[PDB]
Amino acid sequence: PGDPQICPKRCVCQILSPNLATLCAKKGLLFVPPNIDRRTVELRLADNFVTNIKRKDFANMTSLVDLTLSRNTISFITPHAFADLRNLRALHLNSNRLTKITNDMFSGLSNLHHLILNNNQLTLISSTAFDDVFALEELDLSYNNLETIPWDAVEKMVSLHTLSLDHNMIDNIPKGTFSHLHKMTRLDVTSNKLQKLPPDPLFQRAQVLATSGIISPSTFALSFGGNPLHCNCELLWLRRLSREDDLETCASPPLLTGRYFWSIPEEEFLCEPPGDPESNPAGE
Amino acid sequence: PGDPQICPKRCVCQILSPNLATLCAKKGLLFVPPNIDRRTVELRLADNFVTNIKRKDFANMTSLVDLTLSRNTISFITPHAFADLRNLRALHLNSNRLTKITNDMFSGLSNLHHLILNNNQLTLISSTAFDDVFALEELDLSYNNLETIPWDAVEKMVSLHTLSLDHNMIDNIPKGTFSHLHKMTRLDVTSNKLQKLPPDPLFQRAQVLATSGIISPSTFALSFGGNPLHCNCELLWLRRLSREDDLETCASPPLLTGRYFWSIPEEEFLCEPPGDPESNPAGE
Ligand SMILES: *[C@@H]1O[C@H](CO)[C@@H](O)[C@H](O)[C@H]1NC(C)=O
Ligand SMILES: *[C@@H]1O[C@H](CO)[C@@H](O)[C@H](O)[C@H]1NC(C)=O
Ligand SMILES: [Ca+2]
Ligand SMILES: [Ca+2]
Ligand SMILES: [Ca+2]
Ligand SMILES: [Ca+2]
Ligand SMILES: [Ca+2]
Ligand SMILES: [Ca+2]
Ligand SMILES: [Ca+2]
Ligand SMILES: [Ca+2]
Ligand SMILES: [Cl-]
Ligand SMILES: [Cl-]
Ligand SMILES: [Cl-]
Ligand SMILES: [Cl-]
Ligand code: NA
Ligand code: NA
Ligand code: NA
Ligand code: NA
Ligand code: NA
Ligand code: NA
């Protein structure tokens, strides 16, 4: 309807026509203010103490595009809370207390290009949780407890140019995930449990080359440092890249344990014919 | 013995007589280097990826004073790991993955004046864990999951001048804890579950006073903001202090819900004679 504009007592509401924005940031709120005009395009709740997301909070916000909950203490989100936002392109949940991501949490958002989850305690993400977010251009999981993510849903995100997994428990990356993703310019796996990384043509751009007539800048940013790397032939493709030394370190095999990844010559990365690994490349 | 000095390959060892220091910081280590001279006074491991503390790591370090493990990913500490350090005055565990503090973890350290635990996932601290640390001048629990701490052990720390509890789940502070602690200059309870705060004479110094012939600086730093304050007569002593407005907010009673703590007049903080609280001050 054509009702007059609603603004919470503690917030500031801006109208730059047609758009309307509700800025509540750093007001000390313990919960989402009850009266927020449903026509708000941008909603800034960041740097508050809100602990809970009620179903009624964001209900019926059709034109809502940016929503920033960052730096709140949030342990719970009522199901179907975001179910009413079709137009939301960006959502910032970072620096909260979320321990889990359910299937129904993000289920409604088709138009979302940015999902920022970093600096939470999340130990788990449900299998279908990312099925509807396939339009994401940015996904930040950094600084969490995750040992795995819905890889099958991630390999279906075509336009994603940034994936930040750093500072997690992730022990494995499936081998074919990035094949169909040609927009990815950034992957940060730093401080994880990875013993191995899958080869991808994208990673061929993670090195600097020159003296061909042009000095080629690095067009892909990859950081694998801080992982318990098991150093064998499977990582040789990575050892062949010409890169800065980030102090990456091999966890295994025992003779390579403790030594810098780039300080090891290429000839000393060895796979053992048939238990390292385990018809591997030697053949059997 | 008089053995030659041991230094790890990746570290730098300084001798300023008599003292010896081993600086391993930011070397990318996945574990504590095995050879570290047992006579080291200061050991800097910060900004590494070490995940585990073995019994042998710090064993037999008698003269060790400062030990900084900060900004590591550490989920486990072998029992009796610190049992051999009598002279340790400072220990920095901050920014790690520790989820728990056992009874045997700190059991050995009498001389410890500084314990920095901030930015961990700790949900629990065992009842006797702090019994031996009674000499602590600084204890930083900030940014954790704690709902309670060994208050009985804390009220026995006489020389403690700083306690940082901020950004936790703590729902209650016992009423008599700070009575015997006259050295405390700082308490940060910000972003907790506290509905109430106990009155203490120390908190009488948390306000600024002037026009008596001297403008008195604030000699005690207290931050209670970001708590679900239940606003009744029990907090009146706090409302009487003349302080900056940090945007503290009452969670309850319903008529005070959402309103700024300092925007409420003193006459509107009311306790109800006999269920708020519950022979309370009205008498029964
Ligand atoms: C959402 O919309 C429905 C109908 O469109 C209405 O009944 C309900 O009260 C609305 N809720 C909010 C929080 O606006
Ligand atoms: C610690 O000292 C004991 C005896 O003093 C010795 O047997 C043991 O090997 C030492 N361990 C380390 C790690 O220095
Ligand atoms: Ca964009
Ligand atoms: Ca495929
Ligand atoms: Ca393709
Ligand atoms: Ca690790
Ligand atoms: Ca000191
Ligand atoms: Ca007492
Ligand atoms: Ca006394
Ligand atoms: Ca809170
Ligand atoms: Cl927090
Ligand atoms: Cl974390
Ligand atoms: Cl970490
Ligand atoms: Cl935290
Ligand atoms: Na906050
Ligand atoms: Na946080
Ligand atoms: Na390994
Ligand atoms: Na680190
Ligand atoms: Na951390
Ligand atoms: Na309350």
Numbering used by the authors:
A (entry chain A), B (entry chain A): 14 to 287, 312 to 315, 360 to 365
Q: How is this structure described in the published paper?
A:
SALMs, also known as leucine-rich and fibronectin III domain-containing proteins, are a family of newly characterized SAMs that belong to the type I transmembrane proteins. Members of the SALM family are predominantly expressed in the central nervous system (CNS) and known for their engagement in neurite outgrowth, synapse formation, and synapse maturation. LAR-RPTPs are type I transmembrane proteins and share a common domain architecture of an ectodomain containing up to three immunoglobulin-like (Ig) domains and up to nine fibronectin III (Fn) repeats, followed by a transmembrane domain and tandem intracellular phosphatase domains.
Except two loops, most residues in the Ig domain of SALM5 were not determined in the free SALM5 crystal due to lack of density, suggesting dynamic movement or multiple conformations of the Ig domain. As demonstrated by crystal packing analysis and structural superimposition, the free and PTPδ-bound SALM5 structures unanimously revealed that two SALM5 molecules form a diad dimer through their LRR domains packing in an antiparallel side-by-side manner. Dimerization of SALM5 is exclusively mediated by its LRR domain. The two protomers in the SALM5 dimer are related by a twofold axis, and the dimer interface buries a total of ~2200 Å2 solvent accessible surface area (SASA) with a long list of residues involved. The LRR domains of two SALM5 molecules constitute a concave platform as the core of the dimer, with approximate dimensions of 56 Å × 68 Å. The SALM5 LRR-Ig totally adopts a totally all-β fold, with the overall structure in an L-shape. The LRR domain resembles a solenoid with its concave side lined with ten long parallel β-strands and convex side comprising variable loops, short β-strands and 310 helical segments. In the site A, two sets of ascending loops in the LRRs 3–6 are intertwined at the dimer interface, and an extensive hydrogen network is built by engagement of residues R110, Q134, and N158.
